Chains A and B, each alone.
Chain A
Amino acid sequence: SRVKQVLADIAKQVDFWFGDANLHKDRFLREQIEKSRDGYVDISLLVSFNKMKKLTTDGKLIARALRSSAVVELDLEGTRIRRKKPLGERPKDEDERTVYVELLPKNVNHSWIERVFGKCGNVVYISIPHYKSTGDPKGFAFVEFETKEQAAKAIEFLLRVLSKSEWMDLKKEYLALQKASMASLKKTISQIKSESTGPQFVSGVIVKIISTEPLPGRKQVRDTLAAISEVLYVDLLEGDTECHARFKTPEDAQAVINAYTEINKKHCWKLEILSGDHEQRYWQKILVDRQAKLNQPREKKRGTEKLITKAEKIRLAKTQQ
């Protein structure tokens, strides 16, 4: 019957969720065990799980599904469940028991791994990595087999398949060689290096430029207003059609508003001077943005990105001369 099949699925998933390996990996269900009287949790808490919502929301059928159950006991009402056997320590032989496997065909299922790997051993745990909550399998799996010889049989049975010990030593060797190459390149950069209150108030220096067209990048705008006369600031968030510039002098402002030809005829732009209390509130906005930038904590940049940046800039400058 399909009802019996659903009971078998519920018993299978719950006995995995009270399995030893999955409890020794997951933080959360262990905390649901530990924040309890003698290790208990409501069944409707387990109903909230994403694979459990794919099956059954009826807790009565779930309590019927754990009548034939090996490692779950229920208390009285069929609304709380125990682990039957209490949780001991985490074993260390599971590191030896594990199997790493690369090259998955982007159709990764836990059931797909059980369908290929139940034949040679009794599969206990699977780890599968998703690409940053975009729901994509990466292409490799961590399979937990039990008691060594099943896994050593399975590695002999074959989709590169290798041991976790081999994987960990391979990781150690890979990081050692990358550290050696980056040490030599840091020596190269050392050798070539050895070879070689904020802004104050001026009236009328602020030009607001409105556009009807959506504006391009601010580097082009900085080069556009800077090629005519002296820009102190180009204020533009990426995607706004209205922007500002702060200039050095009112002579700079008077020159750029008299640049009618190359500004207004090339592009439909309204280049004007803020006056009134628009200027006063804009100086307030400048001082507030200054205090916000100064109170900002520092950005993070990793070592290999900064080093690959500096290394490519020095390769560019040394190749071009």
Chain B
Amino acid sequence: QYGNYCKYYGYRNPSCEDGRLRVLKPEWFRGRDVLDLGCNVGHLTLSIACKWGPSRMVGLDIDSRLIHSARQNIRHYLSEEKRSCFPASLTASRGPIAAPQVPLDGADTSVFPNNVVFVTGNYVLDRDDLVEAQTPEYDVVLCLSLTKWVHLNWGDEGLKRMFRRIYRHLRPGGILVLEPQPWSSYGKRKTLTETIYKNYYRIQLKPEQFSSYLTSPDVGFSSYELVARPVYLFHKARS
């Protein structure tokens, strides 16, 4: 009822791609700390981590059964290294070859993929006093296809805490990029609970009013633009 699917998994080493990252522009991503939400199979995450170079990139999801599989997906690109092609059935039941790359204490980071790490947790703590307690530690925050489920599951109120919390996690000069869902088919699935329908009719902000509310000083973003579902750049101010 989060709408998450294990399908469309990337077995492929990241030359051939999904195509969302074909749209994205390379300039921000070089050597910058990235927090990225809502990436269950991690295939879009890892493909960013290979082709461009961020220093630290952290994906975050809620389902424990999805983050275990995303750690299997990072183990497959380490198990990437008459040569053998390997029977597909053998890997499925045994698990992939390599170990997880735990670094040394005297270790060098910023090498694929010693950077990336998948942590598990709900994002919204449901308290604005806990929203106020946060500190900035990132430069580029990426969030695709999260507005829909957080909207329908936590009303407007948890979405407002999520916007306020991601403004509390940006360092100044930091960039948030978003490709949110249009209002199009929100109704199509309201009966997963009764609470999901009770929040779908409790919607007090529209996706056209997303870009207004991010410029509203309860969140307080500095300047925003759209260079291409929509493609949006929101900026916290410099320093």
Seen from chain A, the residues whose Cβ lies within 8 Å of a Cβ on chain B are 100, 102-103, 138-140, 160, 162, 167, 170-171, 173-175, 177-178, 181-182, 184-185, 188-189, 192, 195, 304, 308, 311-312, 314-316, 318-319
Contact = CB atoms under 8 A, between A and B. Distances in A.
Contacts of B101: 315
B208 interface: no
A192 B102 CA distance: 10
Nearest to B106: A195
Contact of A177 (B87, B92, B97, B103): B97
Contacts of A162: 87
B94 interface: yes
Contacts of A312: 71, 100
A102 B97 contact: no
A142 B104 CA distance: 44
A277 B71 CA distance: 52
B117 interface: yes
Interface in B50-73: 56, 71
Contacts of B105: 192, 195, 318
Interface in B97-155: 97-105, 117, 119
Given A170-B87, A175-B94, 15 more contacts: A102-B87, A102-B89, A140-B89, A167-B90, A171-B87, A174-B90, A174-B94, A174-B97, A178-B94, A185-B99, A188-B102, A192-B105, A304-B95, A315-B117, A316-B117
Nearest to A185: B99
24 contacts: A102-B88, A102-B89, A103-B88, A138-B92, A139-B88, A140-B88, A140-B89, A160-B87, A167-B87, A170-B86, A174-B86, A178-B94, A178-B97, A184-B99, A185-B99, A188-B104, A192-B102, A304-B95, A311-B99, A311-B100, A315-B102, A315-B117, A316-B117, A319-B56
Contacts of B90: 167, 170-171, 174
B84 interface: yes
Contacts of A181: 97-99
A162 B102 CA distance: 36
Nearest to B56: A319
* A171, A177, A312, most chain B CB atoms within 10 A: A312
Contacts of A195: 105
A314 B101 CA distance: 11
Of A170, A181, A182, A185, the most chain B CB neighbours within 10 A belong to A181
A181 B101 CA distance: 10
B126 to A, nearest CB: 11
Contacts of A189: 102
A100 B87 CA distance: 10
A318 B102 contact: yes
A304 B105 CA distance: 23
Contacts of A167: 87, 90
The interface centre, meaning the residue of B71, B100, B105, B117 with most chain A CB atoms within 10 A of its CB, is B100
Contacts of B100: 185, 308, 311-312, 315
Given A170-B87, A174-B90, A182-B99, A308 B71 contact: yes
A316 B94 contact: no
A316 B119 contact: yes
Nearest to A182: B99
Nearest to B116: A319
A191 to B, nearest CB: 8
A84 to B, nearest CB: 37
Contacts of B95: 178, 304
